[PDB]
Amino acid sequence: QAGIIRDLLIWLEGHLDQPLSLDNVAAKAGYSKWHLQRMFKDVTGHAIGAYIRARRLSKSAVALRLTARPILDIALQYRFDSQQTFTRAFKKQFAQTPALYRRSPEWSAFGIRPPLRLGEFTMPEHKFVTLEDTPLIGVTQSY
DNA sequence: TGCATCCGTGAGTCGAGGGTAATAAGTTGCGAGTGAAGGTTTTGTTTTGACATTCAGTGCTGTC
Structure with missing residues (x-):
């Protein structure tokens, strides 16, 4: 249902890094490799497989x-x-x-x-400004 | 048959603080060796035909 795919991406955005994943590893989410793919195509508007490795x-x-x-x-x-x-x-x-x-x-x-x-997306707002050369004081370090 | 002379020897383990200082002729000639780094050569990270699959794609195909 509609409660599935939303919860899958909470896994998947957190597991876009750790498992070496294709749709076979994604087929452990209740249904087969095609039906979980079939359930994604209409509830999203994106097509899962070539998107994910591109999103990755x-x-x-x-x-x-x-x-x-x-x-x-x-x-x-x-x-x-x-x-x-x-x-x-x-x-x-x-x-x-x-x-x-x-x-x-x-x-x-x-x-x-x-x-x-x-689910519902927390949209940020924008406002285009043009700023000014302001002196300050501070230190730098790297990562 | 002595009489001189000439080498070669002389505690153990520690210790401190620390290497110091004369004097002297030049111009002229002129090859040889850091050196400016000028510039090439390599020894590695990137484009493009492929087509062989692969999973992604979308839908049907069949099923509890």
């Missing part, structure tokens, strides 16, 4: 732009199979070399796909 790449794209690791820390970190295939699907998502992607300081959100909620 979208989890890896912010890891490719704001985390301090090289290509092979994050080659198979997000449960992938190869690096050149990971480089390949990246071209169909961001149209940029990952060496070129962390070359430019500008980070545009083209291929990052948002995390899905079947």
Whole structure:
């Protein structure tokens, strides 16, 4: 029912990292590999399988732009199979070399796909301002 | 048959504090060896045909 898929993503957003998962591992959620896939297609508007590894790449794209690791820390970190295939699907998502992607300081959100909620989404508000050069005092350290 | 001379020997385990200081000619010629780093060469990270699967995709197919 509608209470299932919402609870599956509470697993899945927390288990987008730890299990090396395809839909066979996702088939342990009450029904078969196809029926859990059939139950997702209409209650969401997204198609689960190519989305998740792309969402796990979208989890890896912010890891490719704001985390301090090289290509092979994050080659198979997000449960992938190869690096050149990971480089390949990246071209169909961001149209940029990952060496070129962390070359430019500008980070545009083209291929990052948002995390899905079947329940109610807490929408933040926006207001566009233009700020001023203000002196302060503080120290720096890294992570 | 003595008489001189010339080498070669002399506690054990500790200890402290710490290596110091003369004087002197130059111009001129001129090859050889850090050196500016100029610049290539490699020895590795990235594009593109593939097509062989694979699971993802969507729906039907059959079922409690």
